[PDB]
Design a protein around this motif. Structure first.
Motif, PDB file in Angstrom:
ATOM      1  N   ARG A  52      64.007 -55.360  30.705  1.00  0.00           N
ATOM      2  CA  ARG A  52      64.000 -54.044  31.304  1.00  0.00           C
ATOM      3  C   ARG A  52      65.425 -53.626  31.639  1.00  0.00           C
ATOM      4  O   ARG A  52      66.328 -54.467  31.839  1.00  0.00           O
ATOM      5  N   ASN A  62      65.929 -59.294  35.468  1.00  0.00           N
ATOM      6  CA  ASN A  62      65.774 -58.361  34.369  1.00  0.00           C
ATOM      7  C   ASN A  62      65.837 -59.101  33.033  1.00  0.00           C
ATOM      8  O   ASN A  62      65.976 -58.450  31.980  1.00  0.00           O
ATOM      9  N   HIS A  94      64.490 -49.784  35.353  1.00  0.00           N
ATOM     10  CA  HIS A  94      63.307 -50.691  35.253  1.00  0.00           C
ATOM     11  C   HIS A  94      62.437 -50.301  34.051  1.00  0.00           C
ATOM     12  O   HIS A  94      61.222 -50.511  34.055  1.00  0.00           O
ATOM     13  N   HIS A 113      60.951 -51.029  30.809  1.00  0.00           N
ATOM     14  CA  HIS A 113      60.579 -52.128  29.915  1.00  0.00           C
ATOM     15  C   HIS A 113      61.093 -51.801  28.504  1.00  0.00           C
ATOM     16  O   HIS A 113      61.217 -50.651  28.153  1.00  0.00           O
ATOM     17  N   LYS A 116      67.501 -59.095  27.925  1.00  0.00           N
ATOM     18  CA  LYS A 116      66.998 -58.117  28.921  1.00  0.00           C
ATOM     19  C   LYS A 116      65.645 -57.536  28.459  1.00  0.00           C
ATOM     20  O   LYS A 116      65.510 -57.110  27.332  1.00  0.00           O
ATOM     21  N   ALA A 160      68.377 -52.562  33.730  1.00  0.00           N
ATOM     22  CA  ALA A 160      68.801 -52.995  35.040  1.00  0.00           C
ATOM     23  C   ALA A 160      68.494 -51.904  36.080  1.00  0.00           C
ATOM     24  O   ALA A 160      67.958 -52.191  37.157  1.00  0.00           O
TER      25      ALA A 160
END
Ligand SMILES: Fc1ccc(-c2ncn(Cc3ccncc3)c2-c2ccnc3[nH]ccc23)cc1
Length: 289
Positions: A152, A118, A157, A159, A150, A154
């Protein structure tokens, strides 16, 4: 000096700073990063969080210990060997095609792993890949999560959003075109930067390297414009077309596209086989008698 319970702190390695150390208990060398509890950019503990989330991956350094001793926040890692920059310099800034293709295969896989967790790296450059030592000497590792972010959620998902007008955080030499335009970095950008690193190993330098400028912001302007005015076929002239196919595919990727890592490895693998090379991890530097 006595770090944790079982680690002895030696002199500096290089690069806060990086030190040689010994796991007195296990009889193994380690690397230690100290960070003062005073800093106008506290980093280590955040960086250490990310290293912990990467643990178990092929070519991720193992954390031995994290904690605080005296004035310092401390991270201890298994010792690794020299960087690709250090090995490239040691080899007179000339790598064979076989070596570049051996590296490329592993390097794509490290980046793919980081994305699986991620994160995006955002400082893909020769300094931030290290060869292992001993039984791990055919293994490319990746380091430095100080610019990582990050991309996305965790869990969901989701973006990160398309953002614009940003500052260039990272190494200008390997930055993506979209990074130069001030667009938010995503998975595509890590891969494009790898593309430039691979052509760097082929050429000995890049054409936007060592441009003179009176200031910093002016230098970045010149690098951006040079990159954006150097076609991929010109950058890659005299090298197998695969290097151009790789960069063109990276530049074709959409912001939130999942890269076809597999396609990119297969590309270099087919060329590998056409050249009659064998995946016996004998790099250029392994032949220095
Ligand atoms: F806890 C840490 C976190 C980061 C580092 C590190 N940062 C940069 N390097 C490479 C380097 C350092 C100095 N000169 C040349 C290259 C390391 C490092 C060095 C040797 N073996 C290691 N194994 C895991 C990281 C690391 C070290 C310990």
């Amino acid at each position: 000096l006595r770090v944790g319970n079982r680690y002895r702190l030696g002199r500096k390695i290089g690069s806060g700073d990086i030190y040689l150390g010994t796991d007195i208990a296990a009889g193994e060398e380690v690397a230690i990063k100290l960070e003062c509890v005073k800093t106008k950019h506290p980093q280590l503990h955040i960086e250490s969080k990310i290293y912990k989330m990467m643990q178990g991956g092929v070519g991720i350094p193992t954390i031995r210990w994290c904690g605080a001793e005296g004035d310092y926040n401390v991270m201890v890692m298994e010792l690794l060997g020299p960087s690709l920059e250090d090995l490239f310099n040691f080899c007179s800034r000339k790598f064979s095609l076989k070596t570049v293709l051996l590296l490329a295969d592993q390097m794509i896989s490290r980046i793919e792993y980081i994305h699986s967790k991620n994160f995006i790296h955002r400082d893909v450059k020769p300094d931030n890949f290290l060869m292992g030592l001993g039984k791990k000497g055919n293994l490319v590792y990746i380091i430095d999560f100080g610019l990582a972010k990050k991309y996305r959620d965790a869990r969901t998902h989701q973006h990160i959003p398309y953002r614009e007008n940003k500052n260039l955080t990272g190494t200008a030499r390997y930055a993506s075109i979209n990074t130069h335009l001030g667009i938010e970095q995503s998975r595509r950008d890590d891969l494009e930067s790898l593309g430039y690193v691979l052509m760097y190993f082929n050429l000995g330098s890049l054409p936007w390297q060592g441009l003179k400028a009176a200031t910093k912001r002016q230098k970045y302007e010149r690098i951006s414009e040079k990159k954006m005015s150097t076609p991929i076929e010109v950058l890659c002239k005299g090298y197998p077309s695969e290097f151009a196919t790789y960069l063109n595919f990276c530049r074709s990727l959409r912001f939130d596209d999942k890269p076809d890592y597999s396609y990119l490895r297969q590309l270099f693998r087919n060329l590998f086989h056409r050249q009659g090379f064998s995946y016996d991890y004998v790099f250029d530097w392994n032949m220095l008698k």
